[PDB]
A paper describes a structure:
Human transthyretin (TTR) is a homotetrameric protein involved in the transport in extracellular fluids of thyroxine (T4) and in the co-transport of vitamin A, by forming a macromolecular complex with plasma retinol-binding protein. The TTR monomer is composed of two four-stranded anti-parallel β-sheets and a short α-helix; two monomers are held together to form a very stable dimer through a net of H-bond interactions involving the two edge β-strands H and F, in such a way that a pseudo-continuous eight-stranded β-sandwich is generated, in which H and F β-strands from each monomer in the dimer are connected to each other by main-chain H-bonds and H-bonded water molecules. Structurally, the TTR tetramer is a dimer of dimers, in which the two dimers associate, interacting mostly through hydrophobic contacts between residues of the AB and GH loops. A long channel, coincident with one of the 2-fold symmetry axes, transverses the whole protein and harbors two T4 binding sites at the dimer-dimer interface.
Author numbering:
A (entry chain A), B (entry chain A), C (entry chain A), D (entry chain A): 10 to 125
Write the structure that this text describes.
């Protein structure tokens, strides 16, 4: 798993289950090329987005669609969405975990990088 | 001041001085219309972005260009930039403060809303 | 103002008004000596805690009593309180702002340091 | 594992390896009774702190000793330590994950609660 996404609901203190996550890769011609997508599991984690073969060097955008998750919980949020736009494998491949804590008014993201 | 932006350097624990900030307003035809821009002052704050007359209801994007600020401090960051995309004045006008704590690998944003 | 405290309610996205704040200074004999205290104002800020004469070098604890603030809003929180324990004026006097974002389950603090 | 602790180094974007963690349980006579302790592993996680039999209802303090971890990395930090003081099993037993993102000047904690 070269890329994992984990989402927490910071208001309720619990994993954010079934949040949509889309990943894009910046193309040669400056456009956002769709790369992979999925939904967080009951642990708040999304595995299997990509492979070590597919996950090349690049600029990657991770869009987490928070708006609809709050609606299932009866909330209208402030942020439309959350984004993490980071450069990947710039110096050889890494394992990346994009971590997101959400709220109706705040959000942290962190890119946690390790090696295999 | 219906809209203020404040940026902190969470690594050094100090205001983030002279960071570029661009604000856009989602247009009728789904495009990001440029709205206002500026640079943070020595307190890390950016005032005078807009007026109560200009700052209508809408979906607004605040782009904080972190990448170049780290370069002036000798750092290559992970995130290309930071964004806050929020809906404004949805229920009458408010005062908004978008607050940003930055790092080479993490970032919080919060939308702090009050009335006049 | 060598020491300022600012508290935000990260759940509601607004200043945290009338939160109790106690500051202690580590004494010579390892004990927490009471130093100053107050309540946040309508901006979420607490000014006038101390003076440049009184605010000597030391280890200082800032206790923010979150539990009772949530009760006034009908909430039972997870954290009993929030604390920031930091060393001050270690290399000459500074201005310190202790910043706190709260929630029933999460909390950031940051020590933001500047000079006069 | 009714109680797990995970620590991230938010400055370097990586797990915080071999951080000391002490847990205390508030005793009947208002004192902090030592409960369990350990060191984070290479993933930044600390497992096996306690058992479902030992981890009763109570007020628990988790002390993460950040100061010495920065020293191994050549840093003098601002915060002496990080603490999370939370009430546990108040309404039946839960699984708790205390999550910590650290820095020389900032720190988040979150209590992430789930059921088995």
């Amino acid at each position: 798993c070269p890329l994992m996404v984990k989402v927490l609901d910071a208001v309720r203190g619990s994993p954010a289950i079934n949040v949509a996550v889309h990943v894009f890769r910046k193309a040669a011609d400056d456009t956002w090329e769709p790369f992979a997508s999925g939904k967080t599991s009951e642990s708040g984690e999304l595995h299997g987005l990509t492979t070590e073969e597919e996950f090349v060097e690049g600029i990657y955008k991770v869009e987490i669609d928070t708006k609809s998750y709050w609606k299932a919980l009866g909330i209208s949020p402030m942020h439309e969405h959350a984004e993490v736009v980071f450069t990947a494998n710039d110096s050889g491949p890494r394992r990346y975990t994009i971590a997101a804590m959400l709220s109706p008014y705040s959000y942290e993201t962190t890119a946690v990088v390790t090696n295999p």
